[PDB]
């Protein structure tokens, strides 16, 4: 990220910066002409008396005071309304581009980092670019009103004052280019300190079962002391700067004296060579500010926003473009010679030449020895990850060709460890849908057998299950995750191992009777119990990522194909 | 939180502040005396030849310039250092008091709120305090100088200049009591929009299975447009305080003319009356800054830190004070007429008069109908929540009387949904322990039947399982959550649902063998499968929070007690 780019996100704020600059000029006139009009007013009363021409002249002293404060106020009241509008736009423009990246991206960036860039960084970058544009607009007017006088007093001497500027910028640039490399290693070393404060608070019930809850507060400290060594290095590099300029503004302050002598004796007056200094002390208090800091800050902002400007430009490595949304779907899924391997461990192949299909209207189970690729057959059916070789078909057309917002409304899912949100229940069984009538939420909460325990909570369908449904039992959090996938009435239904993983051994049956036997679905039951997969219309045993057997329970329990060995210890 | 409290947290910086103030005094002295010596040197060099006589006077100008530059640089450096130190101290002192609160606390405050608070509020408070202290010191020095110069001219008029200061303060106190009530409803409405950006990023694999990943980015926006409506009322005020001040500083400039002229025609030189204004213009620019902003800011800091100063003073409602660490623990647990009720739903009793015990060296199981209180018998045994009637005894003495860091080293636990951390595996099977030898991590990873699949990962025991072990299968995250509980040799082991959860029924046994049959443990197997509790030395069936049956498998399958009805559907 260069300096031009950072100033591009402030383009829609020109209508505000001009009205903020104009009201800045008017604030300068009233600050200079005031004395000239004051004496002109004091002489009036001094001529004869007051109350006769005083009011005639004292008026122009009031209007300037009033006419001034209005400007100095309406200005400060807009450079605080452009630090917000620039913030809200830098924040929103990141999220909206941080929530459309392929899923393989959230496995490499810990959710503590991604929030330290959205919360902290975009607050810094917004801050710097406000002040340093609040200043460079003030010091570009004072330098003008003070530069014209340094000519009226001297035509020669002024041309020497302007020989330091090109010097006070070669220095104000050497730090701008070093203050960036640093203010990026502080926003970074400050995020790594905010991924240990989020990983320890979100898991406080498992960091306390072990007694090191007060020792995980000394791994946070030792993460700040590394954001300190980066702060006592950002001071020594700002002290060392003030000296770098101050010295330079001295040489120009001396050389102006000696060369100011030759004139004072021969050419220039002695009264002028003294006033051209007072008016000269300002161009130093400006040549060091106007372009000393305004170009360091603008180079410390571009440092803080060096990463925030990378998540906004990153191109998702899996783009979904297709609008094949039909109106009559059968529900026939097929895996045609699949081959898969994750992006965070690319030396092991998860699936290999897997090939099977689900028939429309039948409960095709899927089993395996707890380490084969079973869920990975769900993280693909739902187009989370890309394939190396092969294609998944849904009714004859590869899933890549369906409308990304429609495919996920005809393929429900019950992930292995269901994750609920911190809302009500009636607002959690209808998560993805716009305003479904409260009638269909109950008609779909009796199928999953939730209405039994929901109508006993302190508040019924309006209770709360906060922070990943951690305020519901392990068995109630599924029957509320089941109902969340049935209220859509989906043709294809996917029940991952959370089907009945944590039920009472009598509840999982009262669901099977109603899940797909009554209506027409295409279920896909992944599980380890022999009960659930007993009556399945089919079974696909896969081991180490290779489909082995495809046969019904008895038709497969006859021959020994690694299936009859699994259910052995369970048949008692 | 008053202002004295906010300032108290900067007590250990008195040394730095006195050093900064001293260097500020020096810088002011230099900047004020420079022109007089400059004129002296110019006169001394113009009187005679300046070639050799100039230096004897320009040396003083050079020394004053060098001194001023050094002072300004050191002041800037020390203020940046003080800001950094204050920020670090506040940050650290928040966490260390935010990770020792009772567990119920973390069930009422969402983990996005806490992190937004910590980060943003600490940054804002430190920034405000630093800027404001700096400005106040500078302005007090300048005001002292100018007030001396003003008294030197008039003894009467000055006493009218100060008649406005109390006015410009009573006004700078009404935008310090309204600007606090506001800057607290911005930090408390900007952290309510950083819990919708953390709840959506940490659950990105379940907010995408439903297609509303780009509609969850328009619930974030509408959470910012309410931080705007506040950031606007915060501008329309600052723009309405400069006016309330600028005006008051006008009446003082008018009233200083009427009384200013009356003295110029009778007893005050007209030359002086003109000069007592220029010096007067640069007190309005200070009486409006020195106490204008420096007392609004200090009242906006106390606003932003209105909550951060509440998590630092909150008293944990469950304090553990007991040191009874023995050297020979038997391992006998007992529940003596327990009665329990959560604090976030205090109208339903979870447990009721529960009473049972675990015998030292026996696998006491525990079962129920998926909604009774079973885990709540573990969130109590580990002293997470307080009881209401009854005691939980560990070897005769209540658990409340054990070293909180020792009790949790003799009672291991396997939560219902295990949660791993984003580290290696050899650094995750030894979480709570300091540097256990790598020989004991393998000897304890073969018991849990994990060494089989660990030595096939791309990197072996050094691979990574990031962000809640989401980069391991559902059945590999259990066998790594067991090894984490067995590497301590706990005399009391608790398996909420670890083996039965997601194991393939083959490695399901190899754990069931070596866990407690070889050594001396006191296991407690919670589960739903008939396999675990089949060979258990005891069973305790509890329903709706009331222990019903306490008998072995056969001794309990004889009499129908809601047990024979549970395992019925699975006995095949
Ligand atoms: N997000 C992921 N990134 C990398 N590897 C993964 C990820 N999820 C699972 N794996 C690996 O894939 C293999 C098979 O995983 P998975 O298909 O989930 O097994 P199961 O379906 O039995 O849970 C496992 O060895 C696991 O280490
Ligand atoms: N943290 C919590 N806060 C409030 N209520 C809870 C919490 N955890 C569980 N519950 C409630 O307690 C009841 C019993 O929960 P629990 O004992 O966990 O059941 P199980 O042991 O079968 O999972 C449930 O109805 C559940 O709603
Ligand atoms: F390891 Be699994 F999700 F059966
Ligand atoms: F509802 Be549970 F944890 F058996
Ligand atoms: Mg799975
Ligand atoms: Mg439980």
Short mmCIF file of N, CA and C in Angstrom, two decimals, chain A residues 176-257:
data_model
loop_
_atom_site.label_atom_id
_atom_site.label_comp_id
_atom_site.label_asym_id
_atom_site.label_seq_id
_atom_site.Cartn_x
_atom_site.Cartn_y
_atom_site.Cartn_z
N UNK A 176 9.70 9.07 7.70
CA UNK A 176 8.46 8.57 7.13
C UNK A 176 8.63 7.19 6.53
N UNK A 177 9.80 6.92 5.95
CA UNK A 177 10.07 5.61 5.36
C UNK A 177 10.56 4.59 6.37
N UNK A 178 11.00 5.03 7.55
CA UNK A 178 11.31 4.13 8.65
C UNK A 178 10.20 4.04 9.68
N UNK A 179 9.36 5.06 9.78
CA UNK A 179 8.22 5.01 10.68
C UNK A 179 7.10 4.13 10.15
N UNK A 180 7.15 3.76 8.87
CA UNK A 180 6.18 2.83 8.32
C UNK A 180 6.56 1.40 8.67
N UNK A 181 7.78 0.99 8.32
CA UNK A 181 8.27 -0.34 8.67
C UNK A 181 8.08 -0.66 10.14
N UNK A 182 7.98 0.36 11.00
CA UNK A 182 7.80 0.12 12.43
C UNK A 182 6.33 0.05 12.81
N UNK A 183 5.54 1.04 12.42
CA UNK A 183 4.13 1.02 12.81
C UNK A 183 3.35 -0.11 12.17
N UNK A 184 3.99 -0.95 11.37
CA UNK A 184 3.36 -2.18 10.92
C UNK A 184 3.73 -3.36 11.80
N UNK A 185 4.92 -3.33 12.40
CA UNK A 185 5.33 -4.35 13.35
C UNK A 185 4.85 -4.05 14.76
N UNK A 186 3.98 -3.06 14.93
CA UNK A 186 3.31 -2.82 16.20
C UNK A 186 1.84 -3.21 16.13
N UNK A 187 1.21 -2.98 14.98
CA UNK A 187 -0.15 -3.48 14.80
C UNK A 187 -0.15 -4.99 14.65
N UNK A 188 0.96 -5.56 14.17
CA UNK A 188 1.07 -7.01 14.11
C UNK A 188 1.34 -7.59 15.49
N UNK A 189 2.42 -7.17 16.14
CA UNK A 189 2.74 -7.69 17.46
C UNK A 189 1.68 -7.32 18.48
N UNK A 190 0.68 -6.55 18.07
CA UNK A 190 -0.43 -6.23 18.96
C UNK A 190 -1.62 -7.15 18.70
N UNK A 191 -1.70 -7.72 17.50
CA UNK A 191 -2.72 -8.73 17.24
C UNK A 191 -2.36 -10.05 17.89
N UNK A 192 -1.12 -10.51 17.71
CA UNK A 192 -0.68 -11.74 18.36
C UNK A 192 -0.93 -11.69 19.86
N UNK A 193 -1.07 -10.49 20.42
CA UNK A 193 -1.40 -10.37 21.84
C UNK A 193 -2.90 -10.37 22.05
N UNK A 194 -3.67 -10.24 20.97
CA UNK A 194 -5.12 -10.30 21.07
C UNK A 194 -5.70 -11.58 20.48
N UNK A 195 -4.88 -12.58 20.19
CA UNK A 195 -5.35 -13.92 19.92
C UNK A 195 -5.16 -14.84 21.10
N UNK A 196 -4.39 -14.41 22.10
CA UNK A 196 -4.29 -15.12 23.37
C UNK A 196 -5.30 -14.62 24.39
N UNK A 197 -5.91 -13.46 24.15
CA UNK A 197 -6.97 -12.96 25.00
C UNK A 197 -8.35 -13.35 24.50
N UNK A 198 -8.46 -13.83 23.26
CA UNK A 198 -9.71 -14.34 22.72
C UNK A 198 -9.78 -15.86 22.79
N UNK A 199 -8.65 -16.54 22.65
CA UNK A 199 -8.63 -17.99 22.79
C UNK A 199 -8.75 -18.41 24.24
N UNK A 200 -8.49 -17.50 25.18
CA UNK A 200 -8.56 -17.84 26.59
C UNK A 200 -9.88 -17.43 27.21
N UNK A 201 -10.61 -16.52 26.56
CA UNK A 201 -11.91 -16.11 27.10
C UNK A 201 -13.02 -16.95 26.50
N UNK A 202 -12.91 -17.30 25.22
CA UNK A 202 -13.94 -18.11 24.59
C UNK A 202 -13.93 -19.55 25.09
N UNK A 203 -12.83 -19.99 25.69
CA UNK A 203 -12.72 -21.34 26.21
C UNK A 203 -12.43 -21.32 27.70
N UNK A 204 -13.16 -20.48 28.44
CA UNK A 204 -12.86 -20.30 29.86
C UNK A 204 -13.32 -21.48 30.69
N UNK A 205 -14.26 -22.28 30.18
CA UNK A 205 -14.71 -23.43 30.96
C UNK A 205 -13.78 -24.63 30.80
N UNK A 206 -12.89 -24.61 29.82
CA UNK A 206 -11.89 -25.67 29.66
C UNK A 206 -10.49 -25.22 30.01
N UNK A 207 -10.26 -23.91 30.14
CA UNK A 207 -9.00 -23.41 30.68
C UNK A 207 -9.04 -23.29 32.19
N UNK A 208 -10.19 -23.56 32.80
CA UNK A 208 -10.32 -23.56 34.25
C UNK A 208 -10.39 -24.97 34.83
N UNK A 209 -10.99 -25.92 34.11
CA UNK A 209 -10.94 -27.30 34.56
C UNK A 209 -9.52 -27.74 34.85
N UNK A 210 -8.55 -27.18 34.12
CA UNK A 210 -7.16 -27.19 34.53
C UNK A 210 -6.86 -25.85 35.20
N UNK A 211 -6.04 -25.89 36.24
CA UNK A 211 -5.92 -24.74 37.12
C UNK A 211 -5.08 -23.61 36.56
N UNK A 212 -4.65 -23.67 35.30
CA UNK A 212 -3.79 -22.60 34.79
C UNK A 212 -4.61 -21.47 34.17
N UNK A 213 -5.57 -20.95 34.92
CA UNK A 213 -6.26 -19.75 34.47
C UNK A 213 -5.53 -18.49 34.86
N UNK A 214 -4.72 -18.54 35.92
CA UNK A 214 -3.89 -17.41 36.31
C UNK A 214 -2.48 -17.48 35.74
N UNK A 215 -2.13 -18.57 35.06
CA UNK A 215 -0.89 -18.64 34.32
C UNK A 215 -1.08 -18.33 32.84
N UNK A 216 -2.31 -18.44 32.33
CA UNK A 216 -2.62 -17.93 31.00
C UNK A 216 -2.78 -16.42 30.99
N UNK A 217 -2.70 -15.78 32.15
CA UNK A 217 -2.64 -14.33 32.24
C UNK A 217 -1.22 -13.81 32.31
N UNK A 218 -0.23 -14.70 32.42
CA UNK A 218 1.17 -14.33 32.30
C UNK A 218 1.76 -14.74 30.96
N UNK A 219 0.98 -15.39 30.11
CA UNK A 219 1.35 -15.53 28.71
C UNK A 219 0.77 -14.38 27.89
N UNK A 220 -0.23 -13.70 28.43
CA UNK A 220 -0.73 -12.47 27.82
C UNK A 220 0.22 -11.32 28.09
N UNK A 221 0.63 -11.15 29.35
CA UNK A 221 1.60 -10.11 29.69
C UNK A 221 2.83 -10.19 28.80
N UNK A 222 3.49 -11.35 28.78
CA UNK A 222 4.71 -11.51 28.00
C UNK A 222 4.44 -11.35 26.51
N UNK A 223 3.18 -11.16 26.13
CA UNK A 223 2.83 -10.79 24.77
C UNK A 223 2.70 -9.29 24.58
N UNK A 224 2.49 -8.55 25.67
CA UNK A 224 2.49 -7.09 25.60
C UNK A 224 3.91 -6.55 25.67
N UNK A 225 4.72 -7.06 26.59
CA UNK A 225 6.09 -6.57 26.73
C UNK A 225 6.83 -6.64 25.40
N UNK A 226 6.31 -7.38 24.43
CA UNK A 226 6.88 -7.34 23.09
C UNK A 226 6.24 -6.27 22.23
N UNK A 227 5.08 -5.74 22.63
CA UNK A 227 4.56 -4.52 22.02
C UNK A 227 5.04 -3.28 22.74
N UNK A 228 5.93 -3.44 23.72
CA UNK A 228 6.57 -2.32 24.38
C UNK A 228 7.92 -2.02 23.74
N UNK A 229 8.77 -3.04 23.62
CA UNK A 229 10.05 -2.89 22.94
C UNK A 229 9.86 -2.24 21.57
N UNK A 230 8.68 -2.38 20.99
CA UNK A 230 8.34 -1.70 19.76
C UNK A 230 7.78 -0.30 20.00
N UNK A 231 7.60 0.09 21.26
CA UNK A 231 7.16 1.44 21.59
C UNK A 231 8.26 2.31 22.16
N UNK A 232 9.23 1.73 22.87
CA UNK A 232 10.42 2.49 23.24
C UNK A 232 11.39 2.59 22.08
N UNK A 233 11.05 1.97 20.95
CA UNK A 233 11.81 2.20 19.72
C UNK A 233 11.09 3.21 18.84
N UNK A 234 9.81 3.45 19.11
CA UNK A 234 9.06 4.45 18.37
C UNK A 234 9.16 5.81 19.04
N UNK A 235 9.68 5.85 20.27
CA UNK A 235 9.97 7.12 20.91
C UNK A 235 11.35 7.62 20.52
N UNK A 236 12.37 6.79 20.70
CA UNK A 236 13.72 7.19 20.34
C UNK A 236 13.81 7.61 18.87
N UNK A 237 12.87 7.16 18.05
CA UNK A 237 12.84 7.56 16.65
C UNK A 237 11.96 8.77 16.40
N UNK A 238 11.32 9.31 17.44
CA UNK A 238 10.62 10.58 17.34
C UNK A 238 11.33 11.69 18.09
N UNK A 239 12.02 11.36 19.18
CA UNK A 239 12.95 12.30 19.79
C UNK A 239 14.09 12.62 18.83
N UNK A 240 14.75 11.60 18.30
CA UNK A 240 15.86 11.78 17.38
C UNK A 240 15.47 12.58 16.15
N UNK A 241 14.17 12.68 15.86
CA UNK A 241 13.74 13.47 14.72
C UNK A 241 13.69 14.95 15.06
N UNK A 242 13.04 15.30 16.17
CA UNK A 242 12.95 16.70 16.57
C UNK A 242 14.33 17.34 16.61
N UNK A 243 15.34 16.58 17.04
CA UNK A 243 16.70 17.10 17.01
C UNK A 243 17.19 17.26 15.58
N UNK A 244 16.83 16.33 14.69
CA UNK A 244 17.28 16.42 13.32
C UNK A 244 16.80 17.68 12.62
N UNK A 245 15.58 18.11 12.93
CA UNK A 245 15.06 19.34 12.34
C UNK A 245 15.57 20.56 13.09
N UNK A 246 15.33 20.61 14.39
CA UNK A 246 15.78 21.72 15.22
C UNK A 246 17.18 22.18 14.89
N UNK A 247 18.10 21.24 14.70
CA UNK A 247 19.44 21.61 14.27
C UNK A 247 19.41 22.30 12.91
N UNK A 248 18.69 21.72 11.95
CA UNK A 248 18.63 22.32 10.62
C UNK A 248 17.99 23.70 10.67
N UNK A 249 16.88 23.84 11.40
CA UNK A 249 16.25 25.15 11.52
C UNK A 249 17.15 26.12 12.27
N UNK A 250 18.22 25.61 12.89
CA UNK A 250 19.20 26.50 13.50
C UNK A 250 20.15 27.07 12.46
N UNK A 251 20.81 26.20 11.70
CA UNK A 251 21.72 26.66 10.65
C UNK A 251 21.06 27.74 9.81
N UNK A 252 19.85 27.48 9.32
CA UNK A 252 19.12 28.49 8.56
C UNK A 252 18.86 29.71 9.43
N UNK A 253 18.84 29.53 10.75
CA UNK A 253 18.61 30.66 11.64
C UNK A 253 19.89 31.44 11.89
N UNK A 254 21.04 30.81 11.71
CA UNK A 254 22.31 31.51 11.86
C UNK A 254 22.73 32.14 10.53
N UNK A 255 22.83 31.32 9.48
CA UNK A 255 23.20 31.84 8.17
C UNK A 255 22.39 33.06 7.79
N UNK A 256 21.14 33.14 8.24
CA UNK A 256 20.34 34.33 7.97
C UNK A 256 20.88 35.53 8.74
N UNK A 257 21.61 35.29 9.82
CA UNK A 257 22.17 36.39 10.59
C UNK A 257 23.36 37.01 9.87
#
